[PDB]
């Protein structure tokens, strides 16, 4: 009686924005499945984020380097917005080295084969001196949700190296999820709906793999409810 929703064209408005649509969805499943997927996506999606920053010259967050137009604090706040993905391994260490004047952008980072900068025009900082040179080592690792500045320090019992910069890692690859239920017309029966999901992400996850991850997590959650253990 119940049809099975099928993946149809997943258009790309941009790298960040994509529309994913599910055509054969039965009555009373439009908003239900939409809320399901939206909550899963905004709540639990793997994402690559910066955790630790090692600028060569400065000693602490509030110490400002000579030559740059920006506080090290603002450099970290821009490093948060780094749109990066790693799919060869869980935790990698990017390296950036740039001298001379100009805007130090993400594209200048020495990338490996397993690391992709999906936003290679991201203005990391502004170097305003010929003599001044910026040397960054950025730790980028996989994770989920949001990890505020309070937890990994317990995984190492204080940052033994000094000059290490701790950054609130926001691994959420997605930033906007919206669902619309529209009257789909198909020869089979008379009442079915397109579920059209707009998703604005940081360009680090494919919409297909994203929806697949969300569905897999939802199925794992429903595992217990399908078979009640008591």
């Amino acid at each position: 009686e119940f049809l099975k929703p099928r993946l149809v064209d997943i258009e790309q408005v941009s790298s960040t924005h994509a529309k994913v649509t599910l055509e054969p969805l039965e009555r009373g499943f439009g908003h239900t499945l939409g809320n399901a997927l939206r909550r899963i996506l905004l709540s639990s999606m793997p994402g690559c984020a910066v955790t630790e920053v090692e600028i060569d010259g400065v000693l602490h967050e509030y110490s400002t380097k000579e030559g740059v137009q920006e506080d090290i604090l603002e450099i970290l706040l821009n490093l948060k917005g780094l749109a990066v993905r790693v799919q060869g391994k869980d935790e990698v260490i990017l390296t950036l080295n740039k001298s001379g004047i100009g805007p130090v952008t993400a594209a200048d980072i020495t990338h490996d084969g397993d690391v992709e900068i999906v936003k290679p025009q991201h203005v990391i900082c502004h170097l305003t001196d010929e003599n001044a040179s910026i040397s960054m080592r950025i730790k980028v690792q996989r994770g989920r949700g949001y990890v505020p500045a309070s937890t990994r320090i317990h995984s190492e019992e204080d940052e033994r190296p000094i000059g290490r910069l701790l950054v609130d890692a926001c691994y959420s690859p997605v930033e906007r999820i919206a669902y619309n239920v529209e009257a789909a017309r198909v020869e089979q029966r008379t009442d079915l709906d397109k579920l059209v999901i707009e998703m604005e992400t940081n360009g680090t996850i494919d919409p297909e793999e994203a929806i697949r991850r969300a569905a897999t997590i939802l199925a794992e959650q429903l595992e217990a409810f399908v078979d009640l253990r008591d």
Partner: protein, 49 residues
Amino acid sequence: VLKIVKVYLAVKRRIQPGDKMAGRHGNKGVISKINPIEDMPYDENGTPV
């Protein structure tokens, strides 16, 4: 007194439940709860509040 040694401590306090974060017009209030991003109300565009 022989010498003075002043050390400066920097803490970066984040907003959290209990912070009297108030409006400009006389609005008052404390942070009730940090409810998640996806539990926030959202318009047709899916933009949370």
